[PDB]
Amino acid sequence: AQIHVLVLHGPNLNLLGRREPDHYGRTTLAEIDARLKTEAEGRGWLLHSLQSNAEHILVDAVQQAPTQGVTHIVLNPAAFTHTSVALRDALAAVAIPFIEVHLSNIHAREPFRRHSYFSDIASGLITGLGAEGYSLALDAIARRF
Amino acid sequence: AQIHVLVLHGPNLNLLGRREPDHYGRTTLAEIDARLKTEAEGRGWLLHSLQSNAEHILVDAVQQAPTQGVTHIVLNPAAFTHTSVALRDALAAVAIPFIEVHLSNIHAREPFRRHSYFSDIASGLITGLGAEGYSLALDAIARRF
Amino acid sequence: AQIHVLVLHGPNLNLLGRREPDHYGRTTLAEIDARLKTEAEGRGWLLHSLQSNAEHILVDAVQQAPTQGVTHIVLNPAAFTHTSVALRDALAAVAIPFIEVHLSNIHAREPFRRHSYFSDIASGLITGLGAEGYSLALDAIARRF
Amino acid sequence: AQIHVLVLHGPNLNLLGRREPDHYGRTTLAEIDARLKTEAEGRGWLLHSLQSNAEHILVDAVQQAPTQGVTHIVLNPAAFTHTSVALRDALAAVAIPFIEVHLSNIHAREPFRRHSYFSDIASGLITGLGAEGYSLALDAIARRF
Amino acid sequence: AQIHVLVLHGPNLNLLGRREPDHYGRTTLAEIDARLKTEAEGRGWLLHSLQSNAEHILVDAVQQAPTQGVTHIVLNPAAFTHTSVALRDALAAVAIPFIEVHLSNIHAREPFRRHSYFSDIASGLITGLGAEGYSLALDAIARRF
Amino acid sequence: AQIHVLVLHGPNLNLLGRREPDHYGRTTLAEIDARLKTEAEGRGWLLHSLQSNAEHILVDAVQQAPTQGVTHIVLNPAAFTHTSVALRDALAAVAIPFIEVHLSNIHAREPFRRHSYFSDIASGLITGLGAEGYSLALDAIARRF
Amino acid sequence: AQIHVLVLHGPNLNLLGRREPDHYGRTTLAEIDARLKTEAEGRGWLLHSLQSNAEHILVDAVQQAPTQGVTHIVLNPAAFTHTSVALRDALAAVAIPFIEVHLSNIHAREPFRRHSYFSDIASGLITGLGAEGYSLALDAIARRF
Amino acid sequence: AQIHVLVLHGPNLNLLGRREPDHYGRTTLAEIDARLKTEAEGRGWLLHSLQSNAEHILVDAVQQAPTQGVTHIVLNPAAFTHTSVALRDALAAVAIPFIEVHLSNIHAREPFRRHSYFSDIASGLITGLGAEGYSLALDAIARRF
Amino acid sequence: AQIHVLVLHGPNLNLLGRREPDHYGRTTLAEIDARLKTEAEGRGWLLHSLQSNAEHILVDAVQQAPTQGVTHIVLNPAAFTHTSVALRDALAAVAIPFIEVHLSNIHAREPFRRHSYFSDIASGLITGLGAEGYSLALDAIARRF
Amino acid sequence: AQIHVLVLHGPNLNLLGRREPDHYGRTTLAEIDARLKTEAEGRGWLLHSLQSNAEHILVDAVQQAPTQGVTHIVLNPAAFTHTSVALRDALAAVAIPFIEVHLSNIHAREPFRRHSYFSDIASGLITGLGAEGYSLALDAIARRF
Amino acid sequence: AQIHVLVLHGPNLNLLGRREPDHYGRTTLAEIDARLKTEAEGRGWLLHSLQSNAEHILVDAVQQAPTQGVTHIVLNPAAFTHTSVALRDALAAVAIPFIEVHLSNIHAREPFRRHSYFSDIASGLITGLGAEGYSLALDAIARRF
Amino acid sequence: AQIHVLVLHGPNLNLLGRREPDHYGRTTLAEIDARLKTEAEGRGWLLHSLQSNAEHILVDAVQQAPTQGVTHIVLNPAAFTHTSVALRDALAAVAIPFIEVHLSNIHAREPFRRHSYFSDIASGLITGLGAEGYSLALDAIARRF
């Protein structure tokens, strides 16, 4: 019954902070992951993070989550938001509640970005708040408990 | 430069907790508003709340917000999410950043609910976390500062 | 357990009988309301009527209906048929059965009129029979009892 | 000038009351037809009823209606509501006013059911009131006279 | 190798000339059929005509056409133009060339009338010329020979 | 509790093997029906077959199936796949499980063929395997038992 | 027979000139209204102006216009352009000719802005000319007389 | 009151018979025009023909037709069928009845070809009969007289 | 810096006043052009007018406008409103501000007329005011200066 | 010329039987694969099975199939049914006939599931029969031989 | 068998280099045409160039190309890309292979620009490379030989 | 500042030349890659090539390109053209200009192929020229320098 959070980052999230740290932003996925680990450790929770450009790596992580003791998922599918029925179906199959996080406002970009294969089965959605969205996701899990 | 939050609740949100407190939920808008006031007072912020079934009352509140010193808006347009171009245009006109909050998962209901007149100009979106979404909205404003 | 009917008339229904009584029709909302009151009094029922050009006035009336003892609603949303998610959501929230009435044939007019925010949650639909539709609505409630 | 009503029932309406009389309903088409005959006889009217699974049988009945002295039609096209341009065109050709009746709420089912080949040329529409819709149709014809 | 024409008339074409001979037209299907027979007899051709309100009767006639020696079909599907995949598929299966005839302008009516299940496999299309369209169809067959 | 299969063939299936036995195929509906009868007799099952170009004949057969002791239906609606809401509704009303069979690949033809009024309520779908699809349907029923 | 103009301004038009008078514009609704009054007084006409964020206030003003002697309406529905069937239906019901005015180019903004519930029943349309559009509307009424 | 036919051929019709006379066809526009002239002279009619690749040349010819005494137009807009609102509007403006002729089956080609800017205002439509369509058009005009 | 207006009239505008001067209107393009010339001469402006049924003639006139000293364009594209990307692109390329004028209400006609290739790059739009729209266009240019 | 079947299972099919064996089903992919191997060995055929959550692994298996001697493919693309153009194009490129198998009824789920990138190039389709679909696929290959 | 290239430039391409040579570009159509002539002369080829704002001039040039000995066409339809079925049909009729060239990225502009009446019958497509696209087109023709 | 080209080939491009070298083509990816290397070496450029059936391998290559010194990308996404938002977003994130190359005409195939997730952010597009498209891409990069 210990809270165990899997944080899943989709493709290209490894690039956070690389190009034009001035214009685009200086926060790195490593910085985000360290901060989520602390916030989860602070609460007495397990947390592990995985980023992948590979759909199958994220699907494997979801498939393995139940036997690893995962209770909650925090997912930023990034590009896969609009494409990955495989990851949607892995989430539906293991039935672990997940919060969908987007750094940016997906409603203010190309029209195709407005469609999510996740939003109808998500247990919550946080967008447009940058990297703070992940910490708010953990806040959301905590505030339920 | 003091943080002043306007919390705006759209139509039917006054009914929270009224019918079948067992099945639907027992939390009341009054309880939500008291909790947001405390959380804002805790941080040294001003906060005022307004619920209305009337589009014009919400539009007036937005129009008046700038001269009242409002810095941030937390908005749950409820039904008006899908209908109120007037409220969208009042938000665009006064250019105060707002976070869009929905209690429920709007992606898991009637198809018409998936369209928001707010999501493309919102500074953040929090859905499907029940009444906790409002407190997370305040958390989001705080975490920026 | 006494039958209490709320009759709700949407915008512009106050104009019935005003302009070109020859071409358009001479029956007035006041005449309709008097006739529904008699037909309800005849059956030992309570009935009250409200017309409004204001969405919030109709929503308030629905919100207040349960504590007023209303058992059935007869609703002619008129223009709001195509626009008012707020009134739909107030009806869904209080869960009082309603019959949707239209004077005219909404299928024989502008294409946008064919969409109703009410027809999928209505307990019955009567259109194209003019003012007689309201009395048939009362007949429908009676014939269930 | 005597009122002569043709009541037309489309495919599958013969099955009313057959399967799971508890869950689905116990009223039979024969019971409906007997009740409409009485209500019409009560008013001094002619009434005849025809059910068919065959489009051509319903079309023939409409084509023959004028020379039989039919003044009004009450039509439940059932499945043909969404498919039968032939029956629509037979109704348009003989120009006898008809009331469209549906037992169920066609707006609360599969999306394809929301389209009617009849609603734009009907003289009235009654849905979602079960078998009472037919008697209300007769009430509607009477209330015009 | 003798030219044998099957003329097929769809539903409601039996009503030609019945109602308001002044406004709508006085020509009858019997008159059309007599005229086509003469024009075909004049040329040394076989011709037989069939009208039906029944899809299956028209489909049977097409299925039987090849063994009857039919070389050409003249088809006015009327309402079935927009609905009868069965008749389309019977025409495709027997591979007898057909000319599609419409009395009226199908492009100047309800939007649904603009779709034909026949026009993409027809060997010719004649519309909007009234009953003369059938005689022009025979002219078209002749002018090929 | 004896397995009784009704095999229903839609319009134009009587033409199998008639035209260009070389190009199109030489197997006849009579040959298919004889083979299904043997395969069902082999298993100790009842089986009866009906083909019709008439929608009402297929609907009648479904309506009558329950009192005849039918346990399973094998249906090739052919053209009616895309048109017959009446047959869909007869299948839904009698609630006998059916397997939908198509000889051809309906996804590789005209776009309109991709829509089935049957696929969402079918208990199985077999397409593109020619006449073998029917025998596989019987195999599917057997393999459940 | 004296020309009496009602000028109706929709939601948010009260904000003209408030925020960033440099970038957005310095002209105020009060300035526009004073200028229209002068131009109408100059011509010997009555003119009254009403702005409202409330749909029902604009609908009431239209409903009351005929008995007030209004001959012409100049309407800037602003956000209601895309939403208010109630105001459209009030204009249709009182049958006073109206000119639709937009300050901005509605065709050069969000796609949803291209739809007007007014343009098909307007007696004229003037867009993209800023506040001058209202004075041109009065010019248009004058130039007819 | 003498019948005067203008035959208008759209772009690329000058190429008839040029490339691969074997595969595509050997009939030339000059041959068609000579044949229509004879058939019109035979009947005591005036006929003139014009082909153009230029929209404005065809529009000018329509604009000039009334003062030239033209009573009927036979039009093959070819590519302009799908594009030329100018030619449609010239035909509507001069209100001379026209028959729309297509050599080919426009329903059996690219999807965009199924749309005609002419079919809803044409006095008749003849397609898929090759060059014979023009002579049938003259037959159609004659058969009206 | 002298105001030089090019007035461009699209196809069929030469026909104004020709057919049924009673029903359709008696004003001629020549009368409109004389009136615009006077109104421009009155203000000390240059004005030249060109009507053409030819897209290329209007495009040439726009291309030549800058070196001719044109400051403003008044354009009635008529049929080309819905078709001429070439004229749109010529206007965009020379970047002279234009006002789009339509005599009629394009929103109250065929659905295809609601689309303009001009409205999103126009500096103003005036419709439904008949020939007065052109003079209002000149008024609009003047009122800016 | 020996029959060699490649059975390809898409993402998440490894989870069969894992979660709630009571509600969802107890059959495992390992059980399915053992049964297909036996049924193929029984017939003297080669069969190999591969499941992958990785699109590239399935594409590689198809690319390699021809040189491995594969004659037939049985494919359950699962989530990739709706997404994998790469796998479709690998199947088209190697031109080995495949049968598409789905455990569930894809027509009775989310609307997006109704689209297959495989159904138009499949040599057969079997859906909604659970794990028996794979054995029926082998039956289908056998029944061709 | 000598390579003879026709280079066709659509409307507005004559304006290249005219307005704001700094921002938009300084290369002129005359410069492009001189460069293509040299590159073709270099290879021993014939080349002629034609620009026109007139659809009929481009169509005439295509119609005349075969008898002039043209082997290849390089076409920049510019605005006509989205509108000219006449030019498409002239290219299809003469069956000379053409390469479609666009200076700009048509996928990165207004949505309507994404549709080409040429791309499905082109022998190649080069976009977004500015004036270099034409020289690459010649390179493409050469590299085939 | 040395030109370094990354050539990326998507799924199934490894199969070039494998099956039916006569019908489909004999050129192999290895032959293409050798030719691009020579052409780049000829110009003093670096070039490396990567083909993958795996989306993540192509995304990794793009992510790594900037630190490897890549200046230009030549990309043939093949099937991923229509599916890979991940690869689009990797290209957008590293902001290296890319030319999109397709061997075939994507506009002349299945409708779904007409959509590219790349064309709106590409620096150029070359299609339908077979393997020569890649060499033209290098020509395009050179011709800019």
Residue F59 burial (C-beta neighbours within 10 Å; 0-12, 13-18, 19+): buried
DSSP string, L118-143: STTT-SEEEESSTTHHHHHHHHHHHH
HSE-up of residue G99 (Cα within 13 Å, Cβ side): 29
With contact defined as beta carbons under 8 Å apart, do G133 and I136 qualify?
no
With contact defined as beta carbons under 8 Å apart, do J136 and F140 qualify?
yes
Q: Taking CB atoms and an 8 Å limit, are J53 and A66 in contact across chains?
A: no
User: Which SS3 state, helix, strand or coil, does residue B57 take?
Assistant: helix
Q: Is F24 a catalytic residue?
A: yes
**Segment (H or E) for B76:** strand B72-76
Chain G nearest CA to B91, separation (Å) = 10
Q: Which residue has the tokens 């987007």?
A: A102
d(CA E140, CA H133): 8
With contact defined as beta carbons under 8 Å apart, do J79 and J11 qualify?
yes
Beta bridge partners of E75: E8, E100
Judging contacts by C-beta atoms under 8 Å, the chain C residues touching residue G117 are: 112
Largest Cα separation within chain J, whole Å, is: 43
Beta bridge partners of G84: none
Residue C26 burial (C-beta neighbours within 10 Å; 0-12, 13-18, 19+): exposed
DSSP string, G31-78: HHHHHHHHHHHHTT-EEEEEE-S-HHHHHHHHHHTGGGT--EEEEE-G
Which residues of C make CB contacts under 8 Å with D?
105, 107-108, 116, 119-129, 132, 135-136, 139-140, 143-144
With contact defined as beta carbons under 8 Å apart, do I45 and I2 qualify?
yes
With contact defined as beta carbons under 8 Å apart, do G127 and G104 qualify?
yes
d(CA G82, CA G96): 21
Judging contacts by C-beta atoms under 8 Å, the chain I residues touching residue H120 are: 110
DSSP string, chain L: ---EEEEEE-TTGGGTTSS-TTTT----HHHHHHHHHHHHHHTT-EEEEEE-S-HHHHHHHHHHTGGGT--EEEEE-GGGGGT-HHHHHHHHHHT--EEEEESS-GGGS-GGGG--SSTTT-SEEEESSTTHHHHHHHHHHHHH-
Q: Taking CB atoms and an 8 Å limit, are E93 and F12 in contact across chains?
A: yes
With contact defined as beta carbons under 8 Å apart, do L40 and L7 qualify?
no
Tokens of D117: 């080949």
Q: Which residue, among D12, E105, D120, D77, has the nearest Cα to F88 in the 3D structure? A: D12
Residue count of chain B = 145
Helices and strands, number each (H, E), in chain K: 4, 5
Q: Which residue, among H14, I100, F88, G8, has the nearest Cα to K62 in the 3D structure? A: H14
User: Binding site for substrate: residue ranges of A?
Assistant: 76, 82, 89, 103-104, 113
Judging contacts by C-beta atoms under 8 Å, the chain D residues touching residue F56 are: 11, 52-55, 57
DSSP string, C49-82: EEE-S-HHHHHHHHHHTGGGT--EEEEE-GGGGG
d(CA L113, CA L83): 10
Phi/psi zone of residue I25: left (φ > 0), alpha (ψ -120 to 50 degrees), beta?
A: left
- When computed from its CA atoms, the radius of gyration of chain C, rounded to whole angstroms, is 14
d(CA L34, CA L49): 9
C108 CB-near residues (< 8 Å, 6+ apart)? C128, D119, D120, D121
Chain B partners (3+ C-beta pairs within 8 A): A, C, G
With contact defined as beta carbons under 8 Å apart, do H83 and I85 qualify?
no
**Segment (H or E) for C4:** strand C4-9
Tokens of L95: 């902001």
Beta-carbon contacts below 8 Å between F and J: 66
**CA distances (Å), H127 to each of E100, H96, J57, in order?**
10, 20, 52
Q: Is I4 a catalytic residue?
A: no
d(CA J44, CA J53): 30
User: Which SS3 state, helix, strand or coil, does residue G6 take?
Assistant: strand
Q: Which residue, among F77, F26, F24, F27, has the nearest Cα to F50 in the 3D structure? A: F77
Tokens of D45: 């009217």
Tokens of D88: 């629509």
- When computed from its CA atoms, the radius of gyration of chain I, rounded to whole angstroms, is 14
Tokens of D136: 């209300």
HSE-up of residue B105 (Cα within 13 Å, Cβ side): 15
With contact defined as beta carbons under 8 Å apart, do A125 and A136 qualify?
no
Judging contacts by C-beta atoms under 8 Å, the chain G residues touching residue C54 are: 54-56
How far apart are the two ends of chain J, measured CA to CA in Å? 12
Q: What is the DSSP letter of D18?
A: S
Binding site annotation covers G52?
A: no
Tokens of C53: 């050009």
D124 CB-near residues (< 8 Å, 6+ apart)? C126, C127, C128, C129, D99, D100, D137, D140
Q: Taking CB atoms and an 8 Å limit, are C12 and G93 in contact across chains?
A: yes
User: Which SS3 state, helix, strand or coil, does residue B61 take?
Assistant: helix
Question: CATH number for the domain including B145?
Answer: 3.40.50.9100
Which are the catalytic amino acids of D?
A: 24, 102
- DSSP H stretches of helix in chain D: 29-42, 55-64, 85-94, 132-144
Tokens of J112: 């997006």
Q: Tell me how crowded residue C21 is: count the other CB atoms within 10 A of its CB.
A: 12
Paired sense of beta strands J124-127 and F124-127, if any: antiparallel
Paired sense of beta strands G46-51 and G4-9, if any: parallel
**Segment (H or E) for H40:** helix H29-42
With contact defined as beta carbons under 8 Å apart, do J8 and J58 qualify?
yes
The phi and psi torsions of J126 (rounded to 5 degrees) equal -130, 120
Chain A nearest CA to B121, separation (Å) = 7
Q: Which residue, among H119, H99, H136, H128, has the nearest Cα to E135 in the 3D structure? A: H136
In Å, how far from its chain's centre is CA L22? 25
* Sheet with G4-9: strands ordered across: G46-51, G4-9, G72-76, G98-102, G124-127, I124-127, I98-102, I72-76, I4-9, I46-51
d(CA H35, CA B63): 76
Residue count of chain E = 145
Residue type, J125: L
Please give the angle made by the CA atoms of J25, J27 and J32, to the nearest 5 degrees: 145
**Segment (H or E) for D124:** strand D124-127
In Å, how far from its chain's centre is CA J54? 15
Chain G nearest CA to B35, separation (Å) = 31
Q: What is the DSSP letter of A94?
A: H
Beta bridge partners of A50: A8
Tokens of C97: 């059965």
K73 CB-near residues (< 8 Å, 6+ apart)? K5, K6, K7, K8, K62, K65, K91, K96, K97, K98, K99
Q: What is the DSSP letter of H84?
A: -
Residue type, E33: D
Largest Cα separation within chain C, whole Å, is: 43
DSSP string, K8-73: EE-TTGGGTTSS-TTTT----HHHHHHHHHHHHHHTT-EEEEEE-S-HHHHHHHHHHTGGGT--EE
**Segment (H or E) for G102:** strand G98-102
d(CA L110, CA J119): 13
With contact defined as beta carbons under 8 Å apart, do J125 and F126 qualify?
yes
Tokens of B78: 């409820």
Q: Which residue, among E49, E41, E64, has the nearest Cα to E101 in the 3D structure? A: E49
Tokens of L30: 């290895």
- When computed from its CA atoms, the radius of gyration of chain J, rounded to whole angstroms, is 14
Please give the angle made by the CA atoms of J70, J71 and J74, to the nearest 5 degrees: 85
Q: Which residue, among G117, G128, G126, G119, has the nearest Cα to G82 in the 3D structure? A: G117
d(CA J96, CA J75): 12
With contact defined as beta carbons under 8 Å apart, do D48 and D7 qualify?
yes
Chain J partners (3+ C-beta pairs within 8 A): A, F, L
Binding site annotation covers C82?
A: yes
Q: Tell me how crowded residue F143 is: count the other CB atoms within 10 A of its CB.
A: 16
With contact defined as beta carbons under 8 Å apart, do I107 and I101 qualify?
no
Q: Taking CB atoms and an 8 Å limit, are G12 and B84 in contact across chains?
A: no
Residue count of chain L = 145
Q: Which residue has the tokens 């006929």?
A: H47
- When computed from its CA atoms, the radius of gyration of chain F, rounded to whole angstroms, is 14
DSSP string, I13-26: GGGTTSS-TTTT--
Question: Which of B12, B80, B81, B117 would best serve as a mutation to test chain C binding (most C beta carbons within 10 A)?
Answer: B12
- DSSP H stretches of helix in chain B: 29-42, 55-64, 85-94, 132-144
Which residues of D make CB contacts under 8 Å with E?
54-56, 59-60, 63, 66, 83-86, 88-90, 93-95, 117, 120
Nearest chain C residue to G116 by CA: give it.
Answer: C112
Chain L nearest CA to A11, separation (Å) = 6
**Segment (H or E) for A29:** helix A29-42
Tokens of E101: 């005839």
HSE-up of residue J12 (Cα within 13 Å, Cβ side): 24
How far apart are the two ends of chain H, measured CA to CA in Å? 12
Binding site annotation covers F113?
A: yes
Q: Tell me how crowded residue L145 is: count the other CB atoms within 10 A of its CB.
A: 9
Q: Name the domain count of chain F.
A: 1
Which residues of I make CB contacts under 8 Å with G?
105, 107-108, 116, 119-129, 132, 135-136, 139-140, 143-144
F75 CB-near residues (< 8 Å, 6+ apart)? F7, F8, F10, F91, F98, F99, F100, F101, F118
**CA distances (Å), J26 to each of J8, J17, J22, J38, in order?**
20, 4, 7, 20
Q: Which residue, among J21, J2, J25, J12, has the nearest Cα to J131 in the 3D structure? A: J25
Per-residue exposure over B60-85, b if at least 16 CB sit within 10 Å of its own CB, e if not:
bbbbebbeeebbbbbbbbbbbbbbbb
d(CA G95, CA G62): 10
**Segment (H or E) for J51:** strand J46-51
Q: Which residue has the tokens 């810096």?
A: I1
d(CA H114, CA H123): 18
Give me the domain span that covers residue I105: 1-145
Helices G55-64 and C55-64 pack at an angle, to 10 degrees, of 120
With contact defined as beta carbons under 8 Å apart, do C129 and C66 qualify?
no
The phi and psi torsions of J101 (rounded to 5 degrees) equal -120, 135
d(CA C132, CA K110): 51
Which residues of F make CB contacts under 8 Å with D?
54-56, 59-60, 63, 66, 83-86, 88-90, 93-95, 117, 120
Tokens of G128: 């993209």
With contact defined as beta carbons under 8 Å apart, do G65 and G94 qualify?
yes
